[PDB]
């Protein structure tokens, strides 16, 4: 008897909170437009998730970027594949320590991979290219941070199939790591979550399954590569969502201290990521906006699940 | 003291105890991970980590499983987060034996401003250093490494802190399933019992070794 009036009070409050939530962002009947990503980026956000990934493919190298293409008018290489993992992890460190003058600290990861096409003719076999999935599958894991709307690099890691083979076979004297082997022993797959497509508007209707095509383009290339059985150890090494992937990337080198580097190196690495690679502060400000918008989108689904649970209890009690 | 229908599952060597219940077709599961560093006193007055646990209440009639992050303070109960998971209580969802539950899901809004209320009384939080890599020396530990703790939202403070009139009905909705302050008074006292039995076993093992 008293369980009915409690479950109906919560279901009426969750229906009123969701009614008052959509009323705040509504502007004269028009709902809240999501923030626009930069050109070429296709954001995929799973429903009921804590993260969203966006992809970018620079054909014919980095010279097809946004900064290298703008010029003044009226007067081959390997392709680059970008992937920005952006979780909802954003916090303020001035509360725990008031000596730090930081208003916002948001972390997001960037994985950049390269793939040789069959169209380049100039530099075929002068040197064996180590960025190819056939030869080592070298990839750069640049962990970034947005420190008061300013992009700061946290770590620059260079991971190949050798580092996944070393951690699984001979990280110790004669064995692998006892914790990295144990984390590979407990790898259960996630249920398929329906992803939402907040892509760039110019590439929203061009092709839909292009990041799905480029995800299995490297997946069939690396499992059938020179390094064959070490790809399950490499996918968990490149797993950007979870604690097993962050521990596995901590077993590798993790790069040098960036503030201990030369200042000519720090400006050249910032000129490469922002200028050449295209991952700029326009994207870095967008990630914190997209972390804020999809937190609002997941709060409404959370309010819908409070109403869905509380109505299911009172109809049975 | 003990609640009405709750079995305790505790093995010596692990700093974990789990409480289970089942009323009708619904099952409510409470898991706690006792801190090894230091736990707060039951008197409260005089590094001093609070006893924070989880509550998994599963209802097959709704099709969802509610995860309730609960913190026991002075024998009472507060709730910091409520999240929803698909299906009934699978074994992988419970953080027993150092394998976590479902990761990469929405944690939920702040139901209460308890952690900001500890800032005015100058009580130190779990985040001792602002450097996240400094606390990643003791990885896979919720008390020492808050950046990978499921119970501490992996160091993230959410955007929405829920309405007081709305979040009061959510606390009353879970208290009919046995997540009241009578349960948290037992968890507060059993965590001090696990913390002493783990310490006297670790000492007597260390005596015979040397």
């Amino acid at each position: 008897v008293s369980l009915r009036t409690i479950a109906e009070s919560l279901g009426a409050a969750a229906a009123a909170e969701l009614r008052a939530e959509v009323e705040r962002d509504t502007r004269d009947g028009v709902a809240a437009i999501p923030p626009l990503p930069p050109l070429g980026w296709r954001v995929r956000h799973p429903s009921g998730s804590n993260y969203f990934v966006m992809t970018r493919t620079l054909k014919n190298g980095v010279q097809s970027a946004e900064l290298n293409n703008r010029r003044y008018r009226s007067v081959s290489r390997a392709d680059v594949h970008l992937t920005v993992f952006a979780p909802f992890r954003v916090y303020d460190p001035s509360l725990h320590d008031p000596t730090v003058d930081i208003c916002e600290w948001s972390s997001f990861d960037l994985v950049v991979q390269k793939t040789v096409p069959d169209n380049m003719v100039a530099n075929k076999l002068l040197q064996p290219l180590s960025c190819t999935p056939q030869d080592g599958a070298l990839s750069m894991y640049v962990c970034l941070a947005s420190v008061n709307s300013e992009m700061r690099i946290r770590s620059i890691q260079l991971l190949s199939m050798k580092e996944a083979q070393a951690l699984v076979e001979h990280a110790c004297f004669g064995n692998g790591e006892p914790l990295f082997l144990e984390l590979l022993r407990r790898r259960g797959r996630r249920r398929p979550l329906v992803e939402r497509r907040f892509d760039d508007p110019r590439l929203r209707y061009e092709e839909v399954a292009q990041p799905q095509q480029v995800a299995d383009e490297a997946a069939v290339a690396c499992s059938s590569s020179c390094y064959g059985p070490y790809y399950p150890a490499f996918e968990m090494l490149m797993d950007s969502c979870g604690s097993a992937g962050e521990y596995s990337r901590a077993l590798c080198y993790g790069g040098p201290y960036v503030s201990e580097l030369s200042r000519e190196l720090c400006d050249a690495l910032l000129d490469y990521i922002k200028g050449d690679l295209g991952v700029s502060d326009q994207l870095c400000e967008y990630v914190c906006q997209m972390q804020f918008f999809l937190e609002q989108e997941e709060y409404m689904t959370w309010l819908g699940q409070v109403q869905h649970v509380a109505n299911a209890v009172s109809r049975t009690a | 003291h003990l609640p009405f229908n709750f079995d305790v599952c505790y093995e010596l060597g692990s700093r974990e105890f789990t409480l289970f219940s089942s009323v009708g077709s619904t099952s409510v599961l409470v898991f706690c991970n006792v801190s090894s560093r230091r736990l707060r006193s039951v008197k409260g007055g005089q590094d001093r980590s609070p006893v924070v646990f989880s509550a998994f209440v599963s209802m097959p009639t709704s099709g969802l499983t509610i995860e309730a992050l609960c913190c026991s303070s002075l024998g009472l109960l507060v709730v910091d987060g409520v999240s929803f998971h698909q299906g009934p209580l699978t074994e992988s969802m419970i953080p027993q034996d150092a394998h976590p539950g479902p990761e990469g899901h929405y944690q939920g809004p702040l139901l209460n401003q308890r952690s900001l209320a500890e800032m005015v009384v100058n009580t130190r939080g779990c985040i001792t250093s602002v450097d996240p890599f400094r606390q990643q020396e003791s990885f896979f530990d919720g008390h020492v490494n808050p950046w990978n703790a499921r119970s501490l939202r992996f160091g993230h403070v959410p955007v929405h802190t829920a309405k007081p009139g709305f979040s009061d009905a959510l606390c009353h909705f879970l208290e009919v399933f046995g997540v009241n302050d009578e349960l948290a008074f037992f968890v507060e006292d059993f965590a001090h019992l696990v913390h002493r039995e783990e310490e006297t076993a670790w000492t007597n093992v260390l005596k015979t070794m040397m």
Binding site: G48, G304, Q305 | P60, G63
Partner: peptide, 16 residues
Amino acid sequence: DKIEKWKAEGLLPEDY
């Protein structure tokens, strides 16, 4: 329209 979408996504399931 959002609750219609969440039942298609599976976030609001049926009776188990």
